[PDB]
Design an enzyme around this catalytic site. Sequence first.
Site, PDB file in Angstrom:
ATOM      1  N   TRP A 186       0.826  -1.197   0.000  1.00  0.00           N
ATOM      2  CA  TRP A 186       0.000   0.000   0.000  1.00  0.00           C
ATOM      3  C   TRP A 186       0.864   1.252   0.000  1.00  0.00           C
ATOM      4  CZ3 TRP A 186      -5.199   1.819   1.402  1.00  0.00           C
ATOM      5  CH2 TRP A 186      -5.223   3.101   1.960  1.00  0.00           C
ATOM      6  N   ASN A 215       0.207   5.761   0.232  1.00  0.00           N
ATOM      7  CA  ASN A 215      -0.687   6.917   0.205  1.00  0.00           C
ATOM      8  C   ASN A 215       0.101   8.177  -0.146  1.00  0.00           C
ATOM      9  OD1 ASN A 215      -0.115   5.723   2.943  1.00  0.00           O
ATOM     10  ND2 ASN A 215      -0.665   7.777   3.676  1.00  0.00           N
ATOM     11  N   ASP A 216       0.175   9.146   0.773  1.00  0.00           N
ATOM     12  CA  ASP A 216       0.581  10.514   0.450  1.00  0.00           C
ATOM     13  C   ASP A 216       1.864  10.555  -0.381  1.00  0.00           C
ATOM     14  OD1 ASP A 216      -1.227  10.447   2.532  1.00  0.00           O
ATOM     15  OD2 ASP A 216      -0.238  12.058   3.672  1.00  0.00           O
ATOM     16  N   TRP A 275      -3.353   0.283   5.050  1.00  0.00           N
ATOM     17  CA  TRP A 275      -2.458   1.174   5.776  1.00  0.00           C
ATOM     18  C   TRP A 275      -1.803   0.435   6.939  1.00  0.00           C
ATOM     19  CZ3 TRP A 275      -1.962   3.640  10.599  1.00  0.00           C
ATOM     20  CH2 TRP A 275      -1.113   4.759  10.615  1.00  0.00           C
ATOM     21  N   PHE A 302       6.078   9.431   8.929  1.00  0.00           N
ATOM     22  CA  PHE A 302       4.899  10.010   8.302  1.00  0.00           C
ATOM     23  C   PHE A 302       5.316  10.970   7.191  1.00  0.00           C
ATOM     24  CE2 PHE A 302       0.888   9.407  11.075  1.00  0.00           C
ATOM     25  CZ  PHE A 302       1.131   8.043  11.122  1.00  0.00           C
ATOM     26  N   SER A 303       4.344  11.697   6.650  1.00  0.00           N
ATOM     27  CA  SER A 303       4.559  12.445   5.427  1.00  0.00           C
ATOM     28  C   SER A 303       5.526  13.602   5.648  1.00  0.00           C
ATOM     29  CB  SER A 303       3.232  12.977   4.902  1.00  0.00           C
ATOM     30  OG  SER A 303       2.505  11.938   4.289  1.00  0.00           O
ATOM     31  N   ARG A 330       1.151  17.311  12.139  1.00  0.00           N
ATOM     32  CA  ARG A 330       1.913  16.578  11.133  1.00  0.00           C
ATOM     33  C   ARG A 330       1.899  17.287   9.781  1.00  0.00           C
ATOM     34  NH1 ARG A 330      -2.579  13.577  12.373  1.00  0.00           N
ATOM     35  NH2 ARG A 330      -4.207  13.386  10.765  1.00  0.00           N
ATOM     36  N   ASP A 331       2.804  16.820   8.896  1.00  0.00           N
ATOM     37  CA  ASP A 331       2.903  17.095   7.456  1.00  0.00           C
ATOM     38  C   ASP A 331       3.538  18.447   7.141  1.00  0.00           C
ATOM     39  OD1 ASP A 331       1.543  14.735   7.592  1.00  0.00           O
ATOM     40  OD2 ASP A 331      -0.301  15.475   6.662  1.00  0.00           O
ATOM     41  N   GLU A 378      -4.619  18.107   6.946  1.00  0.00           N
ATOM     42  CA  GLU A 378      -3.468  17.319   6.541  1.00  0.00           C
ATOM     43  C   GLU A 378      -2.804  17.911   5.297  1.00  0.00           C
ATOM     44  OE1 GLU A 378      -5.634  13.454   6.375  1.00  0.00           O
ATOM     45  OE2 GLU A 378      -4.077  12.762   7.753  1.00  0.00           O
TER      46      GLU A 378
END
Length: 516
Positions: free
Chosen positions: A49, A51-52, A76, A111-112, A178-179, A233
């Site tokens: 998988w 994602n971002d 995820w 994370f992103s 985050r991000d 996000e």
Amino acid sequence: GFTPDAPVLHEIKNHSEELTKAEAGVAAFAAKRNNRWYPKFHIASNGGWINDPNGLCFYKGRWHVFYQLHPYGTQWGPMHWGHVSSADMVNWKREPIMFAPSLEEEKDGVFSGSAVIGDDGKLKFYYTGHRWANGKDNTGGDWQVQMLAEPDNDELTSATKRGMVIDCPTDKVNHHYRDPKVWKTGDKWYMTFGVSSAEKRGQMWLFSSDDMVKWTYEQVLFEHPDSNVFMLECPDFFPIKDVEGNEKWVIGFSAMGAKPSGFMNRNVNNAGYMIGTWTPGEQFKPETEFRLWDCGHNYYAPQSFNDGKRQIVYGWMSPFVEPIPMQDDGWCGNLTLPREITLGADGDLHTAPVAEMEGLREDTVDFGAIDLDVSGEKTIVDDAEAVEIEMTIDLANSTAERAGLRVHATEDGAYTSVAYDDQIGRVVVDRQANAQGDRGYRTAPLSEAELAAGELKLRVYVDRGCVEVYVNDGRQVLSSYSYASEGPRAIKLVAESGTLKVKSLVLHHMKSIGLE
């Protein structure tokens, strides 16, 4: 307080060991992968998988695309950074997995994050380290800080983590934190990322720095006025010239929690932007309403970057609604094509494909002008596995109440529809005849001027398991997963309840980008 004067490095695992484990899972999935829906010309992981999109940049002569990655399943999970690179944005190469959790502040996920070129011409990564608040599952909420990493070489095959550069005042926020994105304006470097405030309100915080390493809190750059929106996000923030040559600023974010209304905010979470002004020292001043980046079924967490001349945006084609049949095939998720962001006379962003995307065309097949003088359909090609269709509809001399293409049209009668709809004045991606997936339909608005132009341009990309529909040179875009059935996948021109005059229809077979 929560802004250390030097990065805080807390190593708990052997990163090379953790990366080796991640390469195994991805490859074990790639070996058993089912390619019925696997993209020919979209970026996906070879297994598992994603994602971002992460760490997007053009650096030392190469295009780089990183992405959130779960190497051990098709849902995820423990987050990593996958990596692909290219020299021309057409022929892509697989790269080693970039990041695995190895630091304390990121033990439950890398994370992103983003990449930006500093004043010395060297790249820096900024990303979020994830911990569970009650270190087991989601039940306790998130515990997220911001991290810094620097590349070991121009090729970006690996990076050195420097540690936490921005801590989280947990008593002052609602977990989400985050991000990040870092950029320079004037003499100061800035960082923004998304926060849930103590009152559960979605916010973008702003920090400043002289040296990109030690940061100082400035203010809340923007707070979403919808109390249902609890978190923002993947925030974005960049300058752009209007048609007069005056500088505006675009703010973008992936908003969580807004309730649907009519055609608007229909996905579980929705990404979009507003255009306005920003003077450093103040908050962002929006001058437009919230507008979706992409109007389709599966689009989320867009990240943009600048190559020195163009602002370019990738989105993640997000599957938020069960069932997700591709999760049975050893992979899940792919990105959009890269899109060039422009602002012209109509006061809105366009996001046409970057010019490089023409290099995907193997050929050009001109079907000329087509007229359907009565309701009905005409098959254009018997089988289209990966093609691009450019077509121009004569709105003024067509009476059809609904007219366009049916793609992935399989012998079981299943198809995806991409048509203009006169009863609502919109372009629609309708999946009601999909044999699998959650189906439904999505719409893209057309202005009063666009409806009165008497002509409508569609640029439709068909891959093995998705569609991307660019309307009127990217004024609107719709990206949706299309789970085609077995057998030949026809493409048909269809006129419903009236006539259809197509001024031009041109097909291009799509090359492989080299990642399958």
